[PDB]
Amino acid sequence: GEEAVRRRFEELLREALAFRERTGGRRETLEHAVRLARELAEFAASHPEFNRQEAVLLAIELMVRAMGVTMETHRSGNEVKVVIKGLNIDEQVALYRAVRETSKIMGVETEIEVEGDTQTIVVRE
Amino acid sequence: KEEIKRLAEELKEKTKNEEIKRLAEEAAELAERSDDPEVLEVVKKALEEALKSKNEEKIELLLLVAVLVAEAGSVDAVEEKLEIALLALKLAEESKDPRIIRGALRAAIAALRSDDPLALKTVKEALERARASKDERLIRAILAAAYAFALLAVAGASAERLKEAEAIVKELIAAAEKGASPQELVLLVIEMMVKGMGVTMETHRSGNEVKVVIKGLHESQQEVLLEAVLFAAELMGVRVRIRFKGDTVTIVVRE
Secondary structure, X not given: OHHHHHHHHHHHHHHHHHHHHHOOOHHHHHHHHHHHHHXXXXXXXXXXXXXXXXHHHXXXXXXXXXXXXXXXXXXXXXXXXXXXXXXXXXXXXXXXXXXXXXXXXXXXXXXXXXXXXXXEEEEEO | OOHHHHHHHHHHOOOOOHHHHHHHHHHHHHHOOOOOHHHHHHXXXXXXXXXXXXXXXXXXXXXXXXXXXXXXXXXXXXXXXXXXXXXXXXXXXXXXXXXXXXXXXXXXXXXXXXXXXXXXXXXXXXXXXXXXXXXXXXXXXXXXXXXXXXXXXXXOOOHXXXXXHHHHHHHHHHHHOOOOOHHHHHHXXXXXXXHOOOOOEEEEOOOOEEEEEEEOOOHHHHHHHHHHHHHHHHHHOOEEEEEEEOOEEEEEEEO
């Protein structure tokens, strides 16, 4: 049940890294990245067995690896807070676009703080 | 001539952007149904320039022109919209500031994608004042207002609410020409977005910074508020801290 979601994450991850080599356009790799985060959330939603929270984290990691930024995951209690550094203005709005959409497909609430190159996302469920 | 078809494919086999690939096919697929010399020449020039550009903003705006002229069949039927695009392209070549070049082209794309004449008029006159003034500090302020106002229009905002947004665009430019600080201009961009969405805001002045609390903003509205403020704050060099909690956006403008 979970092996299906991880296998799909691995296929979208290698597609994200494939488009990362091209860099053909700046916003294009960003719109391609958020679509990949969308396909993962719509896939994990088709397996209700899979953790809805962990799905959002995977889609976030998908975006981080697509844009070539850095990520730190803090797990305390039931909520998970990811800190992403190295974002430009375009990557900031795109990461927010992916988190807001995958949080919905999976039915998860998120708290997002954008400040400079850093976006801090709290995933709770 | 049908050299359009050749110039279109050449971009289509060269592109890495899927939408650019679509517009090039669409522009060539609307031009061969026309015998107007202007249309065949405008699309030819547009596809030629975009074939010789490495800036995705230029390529998209050039292709958006060629599609806009090929569908109408008459250049006179989109001659207004044609002017706004030819002004941003000119301004893009005139400036050396990458934020100005990106701001002029993105505002023209957003204004053309939006179907509102008030946005078209606003962006047009905003580009004319930018090209007239040789002051980069003023040009950035004008573009921060225009590109933001365009994002409201492309978001499908009501014409009754774009009216109240334009009054703040006029106020922002007037304040910028009187040497308003970048923080004051960023606060006015936020004021424009709020009034362009039928929402209220609360301001707090805990020191030399401003805290703005926006309540009742829909998820589709919070994305475009984030995009306009982040772009205006990068144009002005202002540090903003934006927090998304439930239905409340908290922006901290710092100087």
